[PDB]
Amino acid sequence: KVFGRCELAAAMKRHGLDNYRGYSLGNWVCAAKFESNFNTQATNRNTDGSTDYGILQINSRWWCNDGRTPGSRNLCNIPCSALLSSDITASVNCAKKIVSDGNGMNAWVAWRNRCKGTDVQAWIRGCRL
Numbered sequence: 001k002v003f004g005r006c007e008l009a010a011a012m013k014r015h016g017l018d019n020y021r022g023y024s025l026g027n028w029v030c031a032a033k034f035e036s037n038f039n040t041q042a043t044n045r046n047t048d049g050s051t052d053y054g055i056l057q058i059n060s061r062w063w064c065n066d067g068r069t070p071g072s073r074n075l076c077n078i079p080c081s082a083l084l085s086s087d088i089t090a091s092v093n094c095a096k097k098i099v100s101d102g103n104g105m106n107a108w109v110a111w112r113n114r115c116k117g118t119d120v121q122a123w124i125r126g127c128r129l
Ligand SMILES: [Cl-]
Pocket: 109, 110, 113, 114
């Protein structure tokens, strides 16, 4: 599924991401835009052999099991394919564990490089939330 911007903002809010660990909703929408272009089916392979999955590009070396990342942890205890669903619940629940692990949203490279320090509220402007 490819979300609209406000559609995704509304889904993220319903799932408790607004101000989760202090990160306003616009931060999450901005991260999703640049990680996946709002596409739940996005995948990208990394140089170390791990793969990133879904709207928030969650990595198989630490967070989910894709059966082909040796020595990987499965800290969200989910198959990585569950992160590609049109229902974002599994991605959101895993993202909550990631953002609580110490480094906050800096875990998402695109957030650090393209959202951090910008006016992220623009990502939810105009939306009926
Ligand atoms: Cl980047």
